[PDB]
Structure 1
Amino acid sequence: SFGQHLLVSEGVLKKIAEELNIEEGNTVVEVGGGTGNLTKVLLQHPLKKLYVIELDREMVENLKSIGDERLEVINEDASKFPFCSLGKELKVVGNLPYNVASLIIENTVYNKDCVPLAVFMVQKEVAEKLQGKKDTGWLSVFVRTFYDVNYVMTVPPRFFVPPPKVQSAVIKLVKNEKFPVKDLKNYKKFLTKIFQNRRKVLRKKIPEELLKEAGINPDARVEQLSLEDFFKLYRLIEDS
């Protein structure tokens, strides 16, 4: 049966499902780990359809054993899958393994046109970066350009077996597109680049002329920039 590799406290799974605000007619897309037990919790809610995207073929077999007519299992990679091939309005949820969390979140953003809401459990550090208050990163800016990031709760290691070495957190992404970025791949190129060598003053990474035009101190560093700064820089560099 389930819980073969990971056990998560049921209270935590229930809170995660509650954050999704599942209502009649909703389509939910579940990604990440411990899908057996999370799936059972999600199916207690009035969703219309639940897709589970899972690479583990033994787990696929076990999930398929669940009778519910609303459940459909897709044996593909959630860090690469085009979510918008599943439907026009999807709520995405998952406990994300450390080594694919950032990819899955990035992929969710590429699919933002059909993802109004996502709830993820990730390492506390990843969550704090995404929130953008205590820390930041290229993915944080990429995400927050298109979503509001809500830090829901901290999850100490004890709520997992085996426990992780660091605390986890639940975050909620709510679609909110703040800037009209058309080419997401190109925007990512810009953000990844400007975040390389995070300690380097910006004048070593962006021509001073453009920094002054954007009203940015040439001796500022990338982690002190606002979203508005990133967009205006992006536009200045694209128009050059």
Structure 2
Amino acid sequence: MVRLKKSFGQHLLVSEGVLKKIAEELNIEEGNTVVEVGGGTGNLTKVLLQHPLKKLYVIELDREMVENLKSIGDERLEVINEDASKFPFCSLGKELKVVGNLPYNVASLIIENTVYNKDCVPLAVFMVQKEVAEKLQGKKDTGWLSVFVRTFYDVNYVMTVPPRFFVPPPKVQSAVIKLVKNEKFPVKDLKNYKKFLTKIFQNRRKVLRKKIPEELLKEAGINPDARVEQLSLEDFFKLYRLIEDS
């Protein structure tokens, strides 16, 4: 349908080149189950099925856009109508290739959710807002979510997508990012690990001895008078174990 409820952040990607570049990056092989957050009118959906899928899952929230199991008449296509920011991905298999052009308003929530379902997603490819994409990369800017993702996934940037390659053109830039899973370190209950990092990135300009005891930081060999945006990934592991109750 038209009217495209902008409250849902639905901007249809109308560009052949990037649509199939998003699909190719998943490395879809013979018997893979792919999950697509926010299918929409199904521009990416039509491209994913062009690959040798086993099963395409589409998690769409819009009860009018989900009705578009239309011309896309495929036996291996199933459309689930629920919120992908809260949906349990691991209720669809043990190894799932997640993909999706994310709506800006909830994009960060779906990413956080897939990291919760890490055990059943070997790799994910997302189209996100630039200020979210460049943040998750790590090098120029970070956040609590950036480290939360990178702890389990090796984030590798793919491409920038100009606002013109969309129908209702967003005022922000977009980017495709690939989330390849790499076994860094064993963090249990991501619930309290998230709450840990989100307290460290609180007042990120201030020194660290101001949020974690000065000598307790001198323990892990971490400069007490250092900012949050200087710590290696190991540091985040290194100090989380012995400061936060798990």
TM-score (norm 1): 0.94
Task: Using the TM superposition, give the Cα deviation of residue 59 of structure 1 relative to its aligned residue in structure 2, in angstroms.
Answer: 1.1
Q: Distance in 2 between matches of 1:2 and 1:37?
A: 17
Change (3 A) 1:72 1:218: same
Q: Deviations over 1:95-124 (max 9, x none)?
A: 111111111001000001010010001012
Quick check: 155-164 or 172-181, which moved more? Answer: 155-164
Shift of 1:5: 5.6
Q: Cα 1:4–1:79, aligned 2, differ >3 Å: closer, same or farther? A: closer
Whether the aligned pair in 1 keeps the contact of 2:39 and 2:58 (CA below 8 Å) is no
What percentage of residue pairs aligned between the two structures are identical? 100
Shift of 1:64: 5.1
Cα separation, partners in 2 of 1:72 and 1:232, compared to 1, 3 Å: same
Instruction: Give me the whole-angstrom Cα distance separating, in 1, the residues matched to 2:143 and 2:11.
Output: 31
Q: Is the 8 A contact 1:2 1:62 kept in 2?
A: no
Kindly provide the CA deviation profile for residues 112-166 of structure 1, in whole angstroms up to 9, marking residues without a partner as x. 1010010001012211111101111111101111000010111111211222212
Conservation of the 8 A alpha-carbon contact between 1:7 and 1:34: no
Query: Which of 38, 41, 50 does residue 44 from structure 1 map onto?
Result: 50
What is the CA-CA distance between 1:23 and the residue it aligns to?
0.8
Which stretch shifts more, 76-85 or 157-166?
157-166
C-alpha distance in structure 1 between counterparts of 2:41 and 2:181, whole Å = 24
Structure with greater helix share of residues: 1
CA distance in 1, matches of 2:111, 2:204: 21
- Measure how far apart 1:239 and its partner are: 6.6
Change (3 A) 1:233 1:90: same
CA deviation map 1:186-209 (0-9, x unaligned): 100101111111112111111112
Cα-to-partner distance string for 1:166-222 (whole Å, 9 max, x where unaligned): 211100001112011011101001011111111121111111122111111111111
Give me the CA root mean square deviation.
Answer: 2.4
Q: For the Cα contact (< 8 Å) 1:121–1:168, is it kept in 2?
A: yes
Q: Following TM superposition, by how much is the alpha carbon of 1:66 offset from its aligned partner in structure 2, in angstroms?
A: 2.4
Determine helix, strand or coil for the equivalent of 1:121: strand
Report how far residue 63 of structure 1 moved: 2.1
Query: Which piece of structure 1 moves more, 198-207 or 76-85?
Result: 198-207
The 2-side partners of 1:2 and 1:128 are apart by 23
Q: Distance in 2 between matches of 1:219 and 1:212?
A: 10
Q: Distance in 2 between matches of 1:138 and 1:5?
A: 27
TM-score when normalising by structure 2: 0.92
1:3, CA displacement in angstroms?
13
Q: Secondary structure at the match of 1:57?
A: coil
Q: Residues 153 and 4 (structure 1 numbering): CA distance in 2 closer, same or farther, change over 3 Å?
A: closer
Cα gap change, 1:227/1:3 in structure 2, threshold over 3 Å: closer, same or farther?
A: closer
C-alpha distance 35-134 of structure 1, shift in aligned 2 (>3 A): farther
User: When the two structures are aligned, how many residues end up with a matched partner?
Assistant: 240
Q: Whole-Å Cα distance in 2 between the matches of residues 208 and 123 of structure 1?
A: 37
Q: Bigger shift: 106-115 or 123-132?
A: 123-132
Structure 1 unpaired stretches of 5+: none
Out of 64-73 and 168-177, give the one that drifted further: 64-73
Mapped to 2, the partners of 1:131 and 1:54 lie a distance apart of: 26
Matched residue SS, 2:44:
helix
- How far the C-alpha of 1:65 sits from its partner, in A, is 5.3
Distance in 2 (CA, whole Å) between partners of 1:8 and 1:89 is 29
Contact 1:17/1:42 (CA < 8 Å) preserved in 2?
A: yes
Give the Cα separation in 2 of the matches to 1:4 and 1:84. 25
